[PDB]
Structures are given as C-alpha cells and as structure tokens.
Design an enzyme around this catalytic site. Structure first.
Site, PDB file in Angstrom:
ATOM      1  N   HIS A   1       0.704  -1.278  -0.002  1.00  0.00           N
ATOM      2  CA  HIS A   1      -0.140   0.142   0.039  1.00  0.00           C
ATOM      3  C   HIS A   1       0.845   1.350   0.007  1.00  0.00           C
ATOM      4  CE1 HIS A   1      -3.791  -2.729   0.559  1.00  0.00           C
ATOM      5  NE2 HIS A   1      -4.070  -1.675  -0.079  1.00  0.00           N
TER       6      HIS A   1
ATOM      7  N   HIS B   1       2.119   1.724  -5.605  1.00  0.00           N
ATOM      8  CA  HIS B   1       0.526   1.372  -5.865  1.00  0.00           C
ATOM      9  C   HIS B   1       0.003   2.455  -6.401  1.00  0.00           C
ATOM     10  CE1 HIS B   1      -3.331  -0.573  -5.421  1.00  0.00           C
ATOM     11  NE2 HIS B   1      -3.785   0.252  -4.402  1.00  0.00           N
TER      12      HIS B   1
ATOM     13  N   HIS C   1      -5.549   7.776  -3.391  1.00  0.00           N
ATOM     14  CA  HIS C   1      -6.584   6.662  -2.923  1.00  0.00           C
ATOM     15  C   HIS C   1      -6.076   6.091  -1.667  1.00  0.00           C
ATOM     16  CE1 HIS C   1      -4.554   3.563  -4.655  1.00  0.00           C
ATOM     17  NE2 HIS C   1      -5.399   2.443  -4.152  1.00  0.00           N
ATOM     18  N   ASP C   2      -4.847   5.898  -1.584  1.00  0.00           N
ATOM     19  CA  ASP C   2      -4.232   5.037  -0.583  1.00  0.00           C
ATOM     20  C   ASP C   2      -3.171   5.950   0.317  1.00  0.00           C
ATOM     21  OD1 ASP C   2      -5.505   2.465  -0.298  1.00  0.00           O
ATOM     22  OD2 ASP C   2      -4.612   1.657  -2.119  1.00  0.00           O
TER      23      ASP C   2
ATOM     24  N   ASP D   1      -7.752  -0.324  -8.924  1.00  0.00           N
ATOM     25  CA  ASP D   1      -6.980  -0.568  -7.546  1.00  0.00           C
ATOM     26  C   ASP D   1      -6.640  -1.985  -7.569  1.00  0.00           C
ATOM     27  OD1 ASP D   1      -6.421  -0.336  -4.890  1.00  0.00           O
ATOM     28  OD2 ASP D   1      -8.531  -0.854  -4.166  1.00  0.00           O
TER      29      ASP D   1
ATOM     30  N   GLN E   1      -6.556 -17.243  -3.792  1.00  0.00           N
ATOM     31  CA  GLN E   1      -6.475 -16.390  -5.224  1.00  0.00           C
ATOM     32  C   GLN E   1      -7.608 -16.643  -6.241  1.00  0.00           C
ATOM     33  OE1 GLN E   1      -4.141 -13.445  -5.939  1.00  0.00           O
ATOM     34  NE2 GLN E   1      -4.761 -13.666  -4.014  1.00  0.00           N
TER      35      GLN E   1
HETATM   36  C1  LIG Z   1      -7.825 -14.965   0.005  1.00  0.00           C
HETATM   37  N1  LIG Z   1      -7.980 -13.668  -0.476  1.00  0.00           N
HETATM   38  C2  LIG Z   1      -7.312 -12.709  -0.834  1.00  0.00           C
HETATM   39  C3  LIG Z   1      -8.071 -11.651  -1.010  1.00  0.00           C
HETATM   40  N2  LIG Z   1      -7.525 -10.466  -1.592  1.00  0.00           N
HETATM   41  C4  LIG Z   1      -6.382 -10.353  -2.589  1.00  0.00           C
HETATM   42  O1  LIG Z   1      -5.847 -11.276  -2.662  1.00  0.00           O
HETATM   43  C5  LIG Z   1      -5.915  -8.953  -2.916  1.00  0.00           C
HETATM   44  N3  LIG Z   1      -6.667  -7.568  -2.747  1.00  0.00           N
HETATM   45  C6  LIG Z   1      -6.465  -6.540  -2.983  1.00  0.00           C
HETATM   46  C7  LIG Z   1      -7.128  -5.453  -2.527  1.00  0.00           C
HETATM   47  C8  LIG Z   1      -8.387  -5.361  -1.480  1.00  0.00           C
HETATM   48  C9  LIG Z   1      -8.438  -5.084  -2.943  1.00  0.00           C
HETATM   49  C10 LIG Z   1      -5.490  -6.564  -4.056  1.00  0.00           C
HETATM   50  C11 LIG Z   1      -4.736  -7.621  -4.606  1.00  0.00           C
HETATM   51  C12 LIG Z   1      -5.157  -8.849  -4.259  1.00  0.00           C
HETATM   52  N4  LIG Z   1      -4.311  -9.881  -4.700  1.00  0.00           N
HETATM   53  C13 LIG Z   1      -3.401  -9.885  -5.758  1.00  0.00           C
HETATM   54  C14 LIG Z   1      -3.258 -10.746  -6.484  1.00  0.00           C
HETATM   55  N5  LIG Z   1      -2.051 -10.693  -7.181  1.00  0.00           N
HETATM   56  C15 LIG Z   1      -1.457  -9.564  -7.430  1.00  0.00           C
HETATM   57  N6  LIG Z   1      -1.741  -8.428  -6.687  1.00  0.00           N
HETATM   58  C16 LIG Z   1      -2.645  -8.527  -5.660  1.00  0.00           C
HETATM   59  C17 LIG Z   1      -9.187 -11.960  -0.428  1.00  0.00           C
HETATM   60  C18 LIG Z   1     -10.380 -10.808  -0.258  1.00  0.00           C
HETATM   61  O2  LIG Z   1      -9.874  -9.726  -0.067  1.00  0.00           O
HETATM   62  N7  LIG Z   1     -11.446 -11.161  -0.088  1.00  0.00           N
HETATM   63  C19 LIG Z   1     -12.627 -10.105  -0.363  1.00  0.00           C
HETATM   64  C20 LIG Z   1     -13.083  -9.861   1.448  1.00  0.00           C
HETATM   65  C21 LIG Z   1     -12.014 -10.822   2.217  1.00  0.00           C
HETATM   66  C22 LIG Z   1     -13.302  -8.640   1.524  1.00  0.00           C
HETATM   67  O3  LIG Z   1     -14.123 -10.875   1.212  1.00  0.00           O
HETATM   68  N8  LIG Z   1      -9.253 -13.218   0.027  1.00  0.00           N
HETATM   69 MG   LIG Z   2      -7.572   1.353  -0.101  1.00  0.00          MG
HETATM   70 ZN   LIG Z   3      -5.557   0.856  -3.182  1.00  0.00          ZN
END
Ligand SMILES: Cn1cc(NC(=O)c2nc(C3CC3)ccc2Nc2cncnc2)c(C(=O)NCC(C)(C)O)n1
Ligand SMILES: [Mg+2]
Ligand SMILES: [Zn+2]
Length: 313
Positions: A68, A72, A106-107, A217, A269
């Site tokens: 963050h 980013h 944003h962050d 994002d 993922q």
């Molecule tokens: C297992 N798991 C992984 C999650 N999030 C991420 O992995 C992730 N989040 C973000 C930001 C929040 C947006 C950005 C990139 C991300 N992965 C990524 C992959 N490759 C390269 N860069 C980034 C969630 C999740 O948030 N579910 C949604 C809820 C937990 C809120 O229900 N659950």
């Molecule tokens: Mg944010």
């Molecule tokens: Zn962000």
C-alpha cells in the site's frame, strides 16, 4: 507550457497498454504521472510547478509498507490513464482532471492494515469514521495537501467546478472500499442487463466511476503473470503482518492473513479471482467495451493460479 515530458521509446509505447509495469526506478514515477496527466487531460490542466510540488507531497505521505505504497498509488493512476485514453469521448474535462489525482491519493497514509483491524484494535480513526474508515482518512489526507501552500492544483477552476472535482475525488476515494464494490457492481449489472443504464444520469456516473476505481485498484491481477505473481508476495506481506497483529489481540485470523497457512494461498486467489476480480472487469467491459484487455489479463492470471494448484508450477 511548451515543456512536454517525453519517455524513452519502450515506455512511450508500453505505457498506452493496460498491462504496463511502471518499473523499479522510483525517481521516474513522478515524470510518468505528469506524462499521463498531459496526454490524458492536457498541458494546460495543471500549472506544472504546483503539480510537481503536489506529486512530491503525496509521495512523502505514503509509507514504506510492502503493497500500500507510492508504487501502488502510481500503478493505480496508470490503469485509470489507460481506461480514459481508450474511452476518449465518454468523460468530461473535470472527470479526467479529478480521477487521475484521486487514484494517486486513494491510499494516502496507508499503514498496511484493513478497516476490520482498525475496528478490532479500537484505533482512533474507527471512532472518527465508523465505515470506510481508511478511505475517509485517505480523502482527509488529499484535502490536507491540496490546502498546503503552493499545492492547490485546481486554483483556476471556479468555486463550483472546484467543489465538483473534490466531490468526484471524494466518491472516487470512498469507492476503493471493496466492502462497497459488491453492491455497486450488482446495481450496475442489473442496470446494463435491464438496459436502464444511462451515463447522462449523474447517480449512474458515480456508480460507473466507482467500478473504474475498484478495477484500477485491483489492476495487479491484470498484469503479465511474472508481475502479478511477484506483487502477490507484497499484498500477502501486509496480510500476514495484519494476522500477526490479529493474533497479538487474541484473535485467530482468517486463513488469508495467517502466515502458517501459505499452502491455502493458491485456492484463496481462485476464490478472490472468481469472487471479486473476474466480475469487476466483466461488468466494466459490459459498460466500457475497450477495457476488455483487463478481463483478458485477469482470466490469464486466473488460469496461472489453477496451474499452480495442479503442480505444473
Ligand atoms: C484469499 N483472499 C485474498 C484476497 N484479496 C487479495 O488477494 C487482493 N486484494 C487486493 C485489494 C483488497 C482489494 C488487491 C490484490 C489482491 N491480490 C493480488 C493478487 N495478485 C497481485 N496483486 C494482488 C481476499 C479478499 O480480499 N476477499 C474479499 C473479502 C475478504 C473482503 O471478502 N481473499
Ligand atoms: Mg484503499
Ligand atoms: Zn489501493
């Protein structure tokens, strides 16, 4: 005014594409952002001295966290550039001005922890802002720097046009609270499908801009596999750090944030790609067809995660 920023040839070509990586040279990023403003908005949009002093104050107030961070902030700003330059006529002069600056801010001041952890830690910002706790804090930071002396980059707008743009920036920065993505998309899905979507309706515009802000994002899921794979590590470094702090409060964290649960990451993922990203870009393409490349990029990275589970890597 007659002072155009020009990037080396590879970047000049590769920055128009959606999947562009802004590279590991920090000191190039401010020039990159300025190049993007000038082509996306115009050489006239911003007084170059006020812009450059803004950019470097925003840089100062992002922290050294794994994900963050300042990289980013610029990455998200580029994905927004790409969208605008592939949807040339659809967006107003103020929108293009507002959005690029929203994405860069944003962050602002992110600590590497979610709204949930601020609430459970009983952090002061949770008291001040009950919902979208960080995103409201981010916007609070943007407003604070815009008001620093020689930073008001919008000083040529009327009082109304200046309120308009801060409102665009406010909604845009709140949108990035993923906890608001689900309902916002679900409401745009129906509107498209029942064919009642209307871009002259300013409540509909706020929604579509909301989707664009999520899309941008999450845009690390829309890079070539080697960039997405490596950025995964950064996001999970914040996640596992937060789970350590959840453990420290006496709360067993959700597997995602548990650094003992690295075996479960590939599957986590998948669930994320199926649950949040594929639907985000699908619905964005349906509204803005020339954003198809984000969907294609996302699905390719979905397949690479299936392949990691199958042991082929
Ligand atoms: C297992 N798991 C992984 C999650 N999030 C991420 O992995 C992730 N989040 C973000 C930001 C929040 C947006 C950005 C990139 C991300 N992965 C990524 C992959 N490759 C390269 N860069 C980034 C969630 C999740 O948030 N579910 C949604 C809820 C937990 C809120 O229900 N659950
Ligand atoms: Mg944010
Ligand atoms: Zn962000």
């Amino acid at each position: 005014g007659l002072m155009q920023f020009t990037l080396p040839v590879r970047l000049c070509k590769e920055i128009e594409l959606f999947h562009f990586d802004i590279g590991p040279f920090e000191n190039m990023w401010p020039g990159i952002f300025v190049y993007m403003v000038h082509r996306s908005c115009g050489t006239s949009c911003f007084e170059l001295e006020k812009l450059c002093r803004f950019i470097m104050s925003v840089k100062k107030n992002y922290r050294r966290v794994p994900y963050h961070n300042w990289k980013h902030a610029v990455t998200v700003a580029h994905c927004m550039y790409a969208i605008l330059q592939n949807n040339h006529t659809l967006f107003t002069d103020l929108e293009r001005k507002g959005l690029l600056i929203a994405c860069l801010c944003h962050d602002l001041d992110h600590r590497g922890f979610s709204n949930s952890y601020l609430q459970k830690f009983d952090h002061p910002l949770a008291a001040l802002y009950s919902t979208s706790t960080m995103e409201q804090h981010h916007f609070s930071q943007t407003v604070s720097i815009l008001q620093l002396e020689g930073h008001n980059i919008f000083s040529t707008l009327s009082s109304s046009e200046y309120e308009q743009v801060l409102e665009i920036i406010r909604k845009a920065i709140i949108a990035t609270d993923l906890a608001l993505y689900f309902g916002n998309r679900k409401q745009l899905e129906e509107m498209y499908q029942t064919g009642s979507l209307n871009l002259n309706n300013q409540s509909h515009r706020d929604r579509v801009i909301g989707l664009m802000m999520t899309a941008c994002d999450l845009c690390s899921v829309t890079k070539l596999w080697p960039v997405t794979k490596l950025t995964a590590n950064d996001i999970y470094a914040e996640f596992w750090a937060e789970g350590d702090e959840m453990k420290k409060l006496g709360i067993q964290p959700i597997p995602m944030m548990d650094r003992d649960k690295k075996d479960e990451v590939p599957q986590g993922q998948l669930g994320f790609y199926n649950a949040v990203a594929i639907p985000c870009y699908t619905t964005l393409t349906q509204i803005l067809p020339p954003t198809e490349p984000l969907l294609k990029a996302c699905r390719d990275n979905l397949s690479q995660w299936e392949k990691v589970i199958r042991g082929e890597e």
